[PDB]
Amino acid sequence: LTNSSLMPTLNPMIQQLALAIAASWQSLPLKPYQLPEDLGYVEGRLEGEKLVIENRCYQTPQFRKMQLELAKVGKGLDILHCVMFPEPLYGLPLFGCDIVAGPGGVSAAIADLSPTQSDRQLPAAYQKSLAELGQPEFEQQRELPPWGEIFSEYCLFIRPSNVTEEERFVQRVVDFLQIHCHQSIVAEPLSEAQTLEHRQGQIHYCQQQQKNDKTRRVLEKAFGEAWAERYMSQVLFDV
Ligand SMILES: C=CC1=C(C)/C(=C/c2[nH]c(/C=C3N=C(/C=C4\NC(=O)C(C)=C4C=C)C(C)=C\3CCC(=O)O)c(CCC(=O)O)c2C)NC1=O
Ligand SMILES: [Cl-]
Numbered sequence: 260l261t262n263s264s265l266m267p268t269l270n271p272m273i274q275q276l277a278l279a280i281a282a283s284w285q286s287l288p289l290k291p292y293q294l295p296e297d298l299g300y301v302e303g304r305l306e307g308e309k310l311v312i313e314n315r316c317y318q319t320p321q322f323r324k325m326q327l328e329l330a331k332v333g334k335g336l337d338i339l340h341c342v343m344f345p346e347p348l349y350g351l352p353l354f355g356c357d358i359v360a361g362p363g364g365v366s367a368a369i370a371d372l373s374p375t376q377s378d379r380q381l382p383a384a385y386q387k388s389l390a391e392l393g394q395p396e397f398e399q400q401r402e403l404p405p406w407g408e409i410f411s412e413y414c415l416f417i418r419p420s421n422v423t424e425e426e427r428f429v430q431r432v433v434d435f436l437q438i439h440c441h442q443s444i445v446a447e448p449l450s451e452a453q454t455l456e457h458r459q460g461q462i463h464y465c466q467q468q469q470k471n472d473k474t475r476r477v478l479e480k481a482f483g484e485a486w487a488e489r490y491m492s493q494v495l496f497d498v
């Protein structure tokens with residue numbers, strides 16, 4: 260991220276989270292994952308503000324696709340997007356987060372380890388480790404939209420009320436990542452039937468994420484409907 264031209268210009272909480280995700284991934288057995296058209300930097304404008312996106316994407320033997328996206332609309336709107344898609348073979352949940360900020364501060368901060376099992380439960384080891392963290396206190400909880408049924412009971416979705424809350428949220432994401440990295444080492448490869456069940460969970464996650472009109476409208480205002488549909492369905496949430 261020392262290469263990133265966006266990084267210095269993003270909201271501080273976004274910068275801290277980007278750093279924490281990069282630190283988590285840094286020493287993994289990474290290889291690039293080529294996004295469609297080998298996408299890296301992209302920008303677009305139509306009738307309004309310009310949208311700029313830096314797309315980073317990797318894979319490891321355990322993670323089919325690990326994506327970190329940093330974006331800015333004009334000077335008014337900063338976004339961090341991250342998903343780790345695991346190889347269904349290993350039955351790991353989906354780490355994801357999304358942070359949206361403007362000049363007033365962070366408006367939305369979401370993070371989760373989302374289930375892929377048909378029973379919509381996290382694996383037992385994750386349930387146990389996540390419970391041990393204790394329920395965080397946040398002053399300004401937000402209720403997930405209907406498509407958000409995909410998220411676990413541990414999902415965070417807040418407007419951070421102050422710096423203390425910003426730092427508490429980032430630390431909980433660091434904690435989720437530490438659990439996830441550890442559980443990735445200690446799983447326990449699954450049956451062919453179980454592998455299928457997990458693959459299905461991931462497809463469902465992607466289909467539901469594509470119902471988010473908040474993302475879609477930002478993309479559409481800069482690039483148009485067709486571009487946004489391709490980006491959401493082929494670049495971000497590839498089924
Ligand atoms: C890549 C480009 C990208 C854009 C343009 C983007 C925009 C974006 N996401 C938003 C919300 C949101 N974003 C998410 C969740 C996610 N979204 C995700 O991409 C992932 C991985 C999760 C969860 C792990 C949720 C649940 C909301 C709230 C939606 C709503 O209020 O309707 C919002 C509304 C913010 C607010 O209401 O304060 C915007 C503008 N997010 C992006 O990621
Ligand atoms: Cl909905």
Ligand SMILES: [Cl-]
Pocket residue numbers: none
């Ligand atoms: Cl508008």
